[PDB]
């Protein structure tokens, strides 16, 4: 929103850049930070860990009812079967969208998010507009921001991740996909679908 007090976005970046480089230079001389270690972190979360990992679990649960059971009884363990897990998904609890119930996930106190299956959160998930309103007016926010209409008669459960437990929505499998291969179903599985802010893609 407009703030007559706020410098330009360009002047902000220039300051932040100098401050980070000065901080960087100090931890480099302490021996605790290196260029290779920055690059590795960036490669992993730019290219390696992302919502393609979650889509794989989802399409497995959609096609393997017994795995779906295991995913719902204990999420970390189930995802481990597919070789998926680790940092910020050490405890993972998947919640299944039904015809009776819609799930949506938020972190109102900070920015908690299940990295091993969704990668790093998009900026909108970390920001106060989403975090402040989804616990208070989930139904309106989902239509208004995501054009997602939850019929008034369907329960919406908002999961505020205040602990190291990470909640992930199992979105409902779109109709029209009966007999689809795991690869074809995956294309319907979105980051947004496992946050609860959208369904999986129609068609």
């Amino acid at each position: 929103t407009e703030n007559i007090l706020r410098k330009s976005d360009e002047e902000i970046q220039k300051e932040i850049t100098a401050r980070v480089k000065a901080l960087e230079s100090m931890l480099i001389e302490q021996g605790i930070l290196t260029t290779s270690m920055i690059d590795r972190m960036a490669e992993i979360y730019e290219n390696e860990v992302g919502p393609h990992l979650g889509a794989k679990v989802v399409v497995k649960a959609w096609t393997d009812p017994e795995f779906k059971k295991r995913l719902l009884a204990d999420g970390t363990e189930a995802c481990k079967e597919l070789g998926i897990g680790g940092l910020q998904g050490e405890d993972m609890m998947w919640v299944e969208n039904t015809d009776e119930v819609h799930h949506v996930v938020v972190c109102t106190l900070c920015t908690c998010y299940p990295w091993p299956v969704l990668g790093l959160p998009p900026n909108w998930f970390k920001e106060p507009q989403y975090r402040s309103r989804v616990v208070r007016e989930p139904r309106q926010l989902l239509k208004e921001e995501f054009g997602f209409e939850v019929p008034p008669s369907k329960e919406i459960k908002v999961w505020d991740s205040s602990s190291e437990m990470r909640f992930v929505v199992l979105p409902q499998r779109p109709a029209g996909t009966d007999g689809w291969s795991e690869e074809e179903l995956a294309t319907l599985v979105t980051r947004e679908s496992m946050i609860g802010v959208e369904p999986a893609k129609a068609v």
Partner: protein, 228 residues
């Protein structure tokens, strides 16, 4: 603490800004601030709960409008000073140098294999917070419980919108690192963790969807029994 970061239930913050697509890292400085998290963690700057409390002490107007990874920078500096690992006058003099010499080189340094192994280990093996305890869970699914009204000034995970509210225990997760000590430098002192269900009407009054609930995770001391 009772800071602005605790936004659940707040109004007037503005609509959601949601570009159709955005890169993982929007600028080189963001990669740096990101990698600095494992780096200061291994080095003893702080742990996860202490990291969060550093952000929770930011100036509120800067927190609300600054880039997300700038919050991480703030928390690093915060615990760098707290632990004496960061001298501020040196940091301010160098900021000035990189303002005026933005292309000057970084300090000469050796690469360290152990830092990459650290990185890979953490990313793929995680940093699990669950812990075993000698005490059995005090609560169980179906128990009606009321959320604590305490308002500690240090770190805790006590959103203001749940305090003093009544809900039903949904699941017991085991025992985990307790933020209220961990985040304040007082150790893990692990407690049993439970998800608790709060109806929107319990939370918001009449303005609450009669058909909506909020599920919130509570450590054992946060909740006292109402009905079993």
């Amino acid at each position: 603490m009772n800071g602005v970061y605790d936004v659940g239930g707040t109004d007037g913050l503005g609509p959601i800004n949601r570009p159709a697509d955005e890169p993982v890292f929007r600028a080189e400085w963001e990669k740096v601030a990101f990698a600095m998290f494992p780096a200061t963690f291994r080095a003893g700057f702080m742990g996860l709960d202490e990291f969060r409390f550093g952000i929770e002490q930011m100036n509120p107007a800067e927190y609300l409008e600054s880039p997300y990874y700038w919050h991480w920078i703030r928390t690093y500096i915060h615990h760098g000073v707290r632990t004496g690992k960061i001298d501020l006058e040196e940091l301010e003099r160098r900021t000035q140098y990189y303002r005026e010499n933005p292309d000057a080189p970084l300090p000469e340094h050796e690469q360290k294999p152990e830092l990459i192994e650290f990185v890979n280990q953490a990313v793929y093996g995680g940093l699990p917070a669950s812990r075993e305890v000698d005490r059995p869970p005090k609560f169980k699914e179906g128990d009606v419980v009321r959320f604590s009204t305490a308002s500690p000034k240090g770190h805790a995970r006590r959103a203001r919108y749940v305090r003093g509210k009544t809900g039903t225990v949904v699941k017991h997760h085991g025992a985990y690192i307790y933020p209220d000590t961990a985040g304040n430098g007082l150790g893990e002192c692990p407690e049993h963790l439970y998800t608790v269900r709060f109806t929107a009407q319990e939370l918001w009054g009449p303005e609450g969807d009669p058909n909506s609930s909020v599920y919130y995770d509570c450590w054992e001391p946060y909740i006292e029994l109402v009905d079993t």
